[PDB]
Enzyme design. Sequence first.
Site, PDB file in Angstrom:
ATOM      1  N   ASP A  78      37.043  50.686  50.546  1.00 50.62           N
ATOM      2  CA  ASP A  78      38.340  50.951  49.912  1.00 50.62           C
ATOM      3  C   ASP A  78      39.267  51.856  50.737  1.00 50.62           C
ATOM      4  O   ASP A  78      39.210  53.096  50.658  1.00 50.62           O
ATOM      5  CB  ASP A  78      38.072  51.529  48.531  1.00 50.62           C
ATOM      6  CG  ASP A  78      39.285  51.500  47.653  1.00 50.62           C
ATOM      7  OD1 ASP A  78      40.387  51.153  48.157  1.00 50.62           O
ATOM      8  OD2 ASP A  78      39.135  51.836  46.461  1.00 50.62           O
TER       9      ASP A  78
HETATM   10  C1  LIG Z   1      46.644  54.232  43.388  1.00 48.79           C
HETATM   11  C2  LIG Z   1      45.277  53.706  43.899  1.00 48.79           C
HETATM   12  C3  LIG Z   1      44.576  55.024  44.297  1.00 48.79           C
HETATM   13  C4  LIG Z   1      45.364  55.671  45.473  1.00 48.79           C
HETATM   14  C5  LIG Z   1      45.895  57.097  45.119  1.00 48.79           C
HETATM   15  C6  LIG Z   1      43.071  54.803  44.763  1.00 48.79           C
HETATM   16  N1  LIG Z   1      42.330  53.982  43.809  1.00 48.79           N
HETATM   17  C7  LIG Z   1      41.803  52.811  44.588  1.00 48.79           C
HETATM   18  C8  LIG Z   1      41.961  51.394  43.946  1.00 48.79           C
HETATM   19  O1  LIG Z   1      41.863  50.535  45.018  1.00 48.79           O
HETATM   20  C9  LIG Z   1      40.909  51.197  42.868  1.00 48.79           C
HETATM   21  C10 LIG Z   1      39.489  50.897  43.260  1.00 48.79           C
HETATM   22  C11 LIG Z   1      38.833  50.187  42.023  1.00 48.79           C
HETATM   23  C12 LIG Z   1      38.531  48.665  42.137  1.00 48.79           C
HETATM   24  C13 LIG Z   1      37.926  47.875  40.952  1.00 48.79           C
HETATM   25  C14 LIG Z   1      37.616  48.598  39.631  1.00 48.79           C
HETATM   26  C15 LIG Z   1      37.933  50.118  39.498  1.00 48.79           C
HETATM   27  C16 LIG Z   1      38.559  50.902  40.688  1.00 48.79           C
HETATM   28  N2  LIG Z   1      41.382  50.012  42.057  1.00 48.79           N
HETATM   29  C17 LIG Z   1      42.827  49.769  41.676  1.00 48.79           C
HETATM   30  O2  LIG Z   1      43.417  50.638  41.122  1.00 48.79           O
HETATM   31  O3  LIG Z   1      43.464  48.518  41.987  1.00 48.79           O
HETATM   32  C18 LIG Z   1      44.052  47.859  40.751  1.00 48.79           C
HETATM   33  C19 LIG Z   1      45.159  47.272  41.016  1.00 48.79           C
HETATM   34  O4  LIG Z   1      44.699  45.841  41.717  1.00 48.79           O
HETATM   35  C20 LIG Z   1      43.779  45.394  40.915  1.00 48.79           C
HETATM   36  O5  LIG Z   1      42.512  44.741  41.601  1.00 48.79           O
HETATM   37  C21 LIG Z   1      41.590  45.678  41.681  1.00 48.79           C
HETATM   38  C22 LIG Z   1      41.909  46.757  40.513  1.00 48.79           C
HETATM   39  C23 LIG Z   1      43.215  46.645  40.198  1.00 48.79           C
HETATM   40  S1  LIG Z   1      41.308  54.874  42.700  1.00 48.79           S
HETATM   41  O6  LIG Z   1      40.245  54.027  42.126  1.00 48.79           O
HETATM   42  O7  LIG Z   1      42.050  55.251  41.513  1.00 48.79           O
HETATM   43  C24 LIG Z   1      40.701  56.336  43.684  1.00 48.79           C
HETATM   44  C25 LIG Z   1      41.672  57.484  43.960  1.00 48.79           C
HETATM   45  C26 LIG Z   1      41.284  58.680  44.816  1.00 48.79           C
HETATM   46  C27 LIG Z   1      39.872  58.761  45.357  1.00 48.79           C
HETATM   47  N3  LIG Z   1      39.547  59.904  46.143  1.00 48.79           N
HETATM   48  C28 LIG Z   1      38.859  57.651  45.090  1.00 48.79           C
HETATM   49  C29 LIG Z   1      39.268  56.420  44.255  1.00 48.79           C
END
Ligand SMILES: CCC(CC)CN(C[C@@H](O)[C@H](Cc1ccccc1)NC(=O)O[C@H]1CO[C@H]2OCC[C@H]21)S(=O)(=O)c1ccc(N)cc1
Lengths: 116, 116
Positions: free
Chosen positions: A32
Amino acid sequence: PVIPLDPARRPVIKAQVDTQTSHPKTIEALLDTGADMTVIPIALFSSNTPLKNTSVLGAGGQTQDHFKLTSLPVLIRLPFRTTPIVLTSCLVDTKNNWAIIGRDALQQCQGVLYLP
Amino acid sequence: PVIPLDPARRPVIKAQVDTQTSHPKTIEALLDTGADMTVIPIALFSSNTPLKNTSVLGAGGQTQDHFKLTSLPVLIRLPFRTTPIVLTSCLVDTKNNWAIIGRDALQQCQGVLYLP
Ligand SMILES: CCC(CC)CN(C[C@@H](O)[C@H](Cc1ccccc1)NC(=O)O[C@H]1CO[C@H]2OCC[C@H]21)S(=O)(=O)c1ccc(N)cc1
């Protein structure tokens, strides 16, 4: 290796994670680039180990104690690397037991994102 | 290009986004292998445009109506690409006003993650 990117298949790998509070365990982790910091499931620990509290911005908002911080470094071994990744600290998911490899870990592999 | 991965610097790019509901705008977007679907700030649409409701995987919990879905496709142009990315559907941030390039778009870039 080269990891292709597809909306339909999450990019995961098998990682051996050593919290230093139990024997090392293999988990399947999401790779990620949008995660600043690695997240590992509380299931990897003993329930007698100390964790620290923490805030984190997330995709659903900002929550209390969903995530905790480890006190000791965490070592991670990937199938294709001799050496462990050593993270001074990383997040611990006390609810969904997510496993997410973030940019703290990808920098130590010298992982990169390539757009041709 | 090659985009190195660093916990301290988010991997971002400048992308021109065409919602087809107002004039196109260049914004700064986070390149995110952990996102199934690209996320666009609601500010880029018109306030007369229909969006549909839906749930989204997110951190900190589950977000019912934080995110909506677009009605029309979204076209995205990158600095190094003449031709647009065409997303038949993508998420809309009605609050935190995030811009995230997900795996739906990186697949059409032929983007990959490389771990040496
Ligand atoms: C704003 C996104 C933030 C940046 C500050 C980072 N995210 C990563 C994200 O990739 C997360 C990773 C994640 C993947 C799958 C299930 C739960 C979390 N999933 C996600 O939010 O993506 C969504 C939008 O597209 C869709 O397809 C996948 C999910 C949807 S997070 O999960 O909230 C996260 C934030 C900070 C840390 N240190 C570790 C993880």
